[PDB]
Design a protein around this ligand. Structure first.
Ligand SMILES: CCN1CCC2(CC1)C[C@@H]2C(=O)N[C@@H](CCCCCC(O)(O)CC)c1ncc(-c2ccc3c(=O)n(CC)ccc3c2)[nH]1
Ligand SMILES: [Ca+2]
Ligand SMILES: [Ca+2]
Ligand SMILES: [Zn+2]
Length: 368
């Protein structure tokens, strides 16, 4: 039936700025919050302000040297850290900006607090739209990500859950999370992403895990222009088979919105309904669920997407006509919640989709 939903948000998150021209815009988190408040979605959720995660909480995964660097670097002292900046991949994709460490603490705080709430059985679903920064590595920043809030949240869930399933629907491969758990069977990572001449270059369907983790990493490589019909046709059957074979006791779903049509960096053609069908599919299994953000670079569509996915979590129907809000002008010329797909060609033929699904099913037959 209807579930208890806890939502994590800090009103300062929207003020963090990556710099002029950088596609990552924390302001999209504030637009999402304001839109869902104006739809009345606050009347059904417990809203919490996450704590600022400590360097100590972050070192449950990341190295002490890397977290010490993040806590020390600033735009005013950057000249003294040229050596560590190259070593930790701090540069154009992952720049030094004012309040960088505080932004990491808030993003991580929401994910870890959500996992603690799920572990205590105090909620069925926990939502942190500021999290989902799946590329960050143990001692390296990557792809706009500095601290891997997902790995930290999963480590928290592993205190009470023997098996945790991670599902990633961002257009980019969830490499940081896959790498962190590559040799263990306690986490199964499933990533659906664009593969071929695209960042980060990993996530081949032949990458299936190693050692005790062999068959516990699943990658569905896709080409440009995937649509709701095609995505929906493989998502439910793959997730159903994974649920049946793996039997996880908790789930983490990364809801990166750069897989929507019209994304500034993505080249997929999903609508908000097609993207949200993934949330509906996962929710149907009735397991403790941590829903996270991620990519999304056409910020009016990210706000529409995550507002609709929050409504899905709450089993609340919301009208297509957008209510008046602080960012109303960003949603023109239509002022509607739902989006239309473009005329882009879907390079993922129905035969390619079935063939990749069949190869993934063969790998899933290898689980105990
Ligand atoms: C310098 C850019 N150059 C790209 C090629 C280069 C090396 C840097 C090889 C690496 C690569 O392709 N980086 C990828 C990383 C994608 C992370 C997704 C993150 C998630 O969505 O998965 C989850 C949060 C990527 N794609 C597009 C950009 C991009 C475009 C434009 C700009 C830009 O105008 N500015 C203003 C100075 C700053 C940054 C910047 C970055 N970077
Ligand atoms: Ca993905
Ligand atoms: Ca694994
Ligand atoms: Zn992405």
């Amino acid at each position: 039936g209807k579930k208890k939903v806890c939502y994590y948000y800090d009103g300062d998150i929207g003020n963090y700025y990556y710099g002029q021209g950088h596609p990552m815009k924390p302001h999209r988190i504030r637009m999402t919050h304001n839109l869902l408040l104006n739809y009345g979605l606050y009347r059904k959720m417990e809203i919490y302000r996450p704590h600022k995660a400590t360097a100590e909480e972050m070192t449950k995964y990341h190295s002490d040297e890397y977290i010490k660097f993040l806590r020390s670097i600033r735009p005013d002292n950057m000249s003294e850290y040229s050596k560590q900046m190259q070593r930790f991949n701090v540069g154009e994709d992952c720049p030094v900006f004012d309040g960088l460490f505080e932004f990491c603490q808030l993003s991580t705080g929401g994910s870890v607090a959500g996992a603690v709430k799920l572990n205590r059985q105090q909620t069925d679903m926990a939502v942190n739209w500021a999290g989902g920064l799946h590329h960050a590595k143990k001692s390296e920043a990557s792809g706009f990500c500095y601290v891997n809030d997902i790995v930290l949240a999963i480590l928290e869930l592993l205190k009470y859950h023997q098996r945790v399933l991670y599902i990633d629907i961002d257009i980019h491969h969830g490499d940081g999370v896959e790498e962190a758990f590559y040799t263990t069977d306690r986490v199964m990572t499933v990533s659906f992403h664009k593969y071929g001449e695209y960042f980060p270059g990993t996530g081949d369907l032949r990458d299936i895990g190693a050692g005790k983790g062999k068959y516990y990493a699943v990658n569905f490589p896709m080409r440009d222009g995937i649509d709701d019909e095609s995505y929906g046709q493989i998502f439910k059957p793959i997730i159903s088979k994974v649920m049946e074979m793996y039997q996880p006791s908790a789930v983490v779903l990364q809801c990166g919105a750069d897989s929507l049509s019209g994304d500034r960096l993505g080249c997929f053609n999903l609508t908000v309904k097609g993207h949200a069908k993934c949330v509906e599919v996962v929710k149907t299994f009735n397991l403790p669920l941590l829903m996270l953000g991620g990519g999304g670079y056409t910020i009016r569509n990210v706000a529409r997407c995550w507002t609709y996915e929050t409504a899905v979590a709450l089993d609340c129907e919301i009208p297509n006509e957008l209510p008046y809000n602080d960012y109303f002008e960003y949603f023109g010329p239509d002022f509607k919640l739902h989006i239309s797909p473009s005329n882009m060609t879907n390079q993922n033929t129905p035969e390619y989709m079935e063939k990749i699904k069949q190869r993934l099913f063969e790998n899933l037959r290898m689980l105990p």
